[PDB]
Write a protein that binds this ligand. Structure first.
Ligand SMILES: CC(C)C[C@@H](NC(=N)N)C(=O)NCC(=O)N1CCC(c2cc(-c3ccc(OCc4ccc(C(=O)O)o4)c(Cl)c3Cl)nn2C)CC1
Length: 117
């Protein structure tokens, strides 16, 4: 059970990393930063993945406007939902962020959980 959680988080880490790498390869990059995302106040536990889940449709939107995007987010949606049974109301920070800041924060979040086992 613990190994399946570690490999799920690693798969989530790769997918977010795959998006961020393609974003840096793009004038076009400046236009992609106008798209704003809601961010968590503090992401420490696995329960906070509800903040990412809520922002997956907005993530699909920006990838469509730029990158199949519908197939990629569908895979992320399953993994996130499988990783988090518990109803947790998510808390969003006062400041919104760009696509680059959104991805990097969740990449760092994923790297924190893998380290805590
Ligand atoms: C209040 C806000 C936090 C709520 C938020 N929802 C949420 N995250 N929960 C939301 O709705 N945000 C959406 C948003 O921020 N938008 C503003 C930007 C909009 C937008 C961007 C582009 C867009 C256009 C063009 C683009 O690039 C193509 C291109 C080709 C070449 C060049 C160039 O030379 O610059 O530009 C790209 Cl990457 C994008 Cl993202 N199209 N539109 C309408 C979408 C809505």
């Amino acid at each position: 059970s613990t190994k399946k959680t570690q490999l799920q988080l690693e798969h989530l880490l790769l997918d977010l990393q795959m998006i961020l790498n393609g974003i840096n390869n793009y004038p076009k990059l400046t236009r992609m930063l106008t798209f704003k995302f809601y961010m968590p106040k503090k992401a420490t536990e696995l329960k906070h993945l509800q903040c990412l889940e809520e922002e997956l449709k907005p993530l699909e939107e920006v990838l469509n406007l730029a990158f199949r995007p519908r197939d990629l987010i569908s895979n992320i949606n399953v993994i996130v939902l499988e990783l988090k049974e518990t109803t947790f109301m998510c808390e969003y920070a006062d400041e919104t962020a760009t696509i680059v800041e959104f991805l990097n924060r969740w990449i760092t979040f994923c790297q924190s959980i893998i380290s805590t086992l």
